[PDB]
Design a binder for this molecule. Structure first.
Ligand code: CXG
Lengths: 99, 99
């Protein structure tokens, strides 16, 4: 679908059996979600953005569904102020910027 | 053009007659650039990012070219890890998300 940017591009995502609202962010390298439980192994990671860095848990090969489009990839979980879907997953659903 | 997201959506922008590299960020409400000089008076603004808040200088009605597309809008100047072009300007150049 074509998403305009007049408003924040928020979408519903299905992950870990849960439904969450997340921001499609082309400027984000990774996908980071607020505290939640995910299965499998994980490793600590520090990610930075405006304001500095925050520590998160990195889970790889996590199944995810965005706007009906299924994909799998790395999901970071930590004290992020808002849920963000990064390029690592945007690519998988064939998302592109156009103008 | 159509920009894929396998790599960071970095583009060349021109502001104050100088060329700079910036990231097209759909997850940003505003446009924030690294320290630089701009004409006129500025207003204070506190913006929040993944790592927390920072104080920035707000300049309005600033001419800025993005990938050749002409825009004139608000530009925030402050301690940002990278130059980011937010929705306020992405909308001026007709940018949309597609998948
Ligand atoms: C290598 N790091 C990254 O790729 C990281 N990227 C970012 O932080 C970037 O993509 C913006 C990611 C979206 N985020 C989402 C966000 C939304 C709301 C809040 C917030 C604010 C106050 C209170 C509660 C929440 C925090 C973050 N939005 C903002 O931070 C913007 N904020 C905004 O639109 O909010 C007014 C800003 C104007 C400050 C730029 C900006 C960035 C790009 C490239 C290099 C360094 C940084 C990472 C989070 C994916 C690891």
């Amino acid at each position: 679908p074509q998403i305009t940017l007049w408003q924040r591009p928020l979408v519903t995502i299905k992950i870990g059996g849960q439904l969450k609202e997340a921001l499609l962010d082309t400027g984000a390298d990774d996908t980071v979600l607020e505290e939640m439980s995910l299965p499998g192994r994980w490793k600590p990671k520090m990610i930075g953005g405006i304001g500095g860095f925050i520590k998160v848990r990195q889970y790889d090969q996590i199944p995810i569904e965005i706007c009906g489009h299924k994909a799998i990839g790395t999901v970071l979980v930590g004290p992020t102020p808002t849920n963000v879907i990064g390029r690592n997953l945007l690519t998988q659903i064939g998302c592109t910027l156009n103008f």
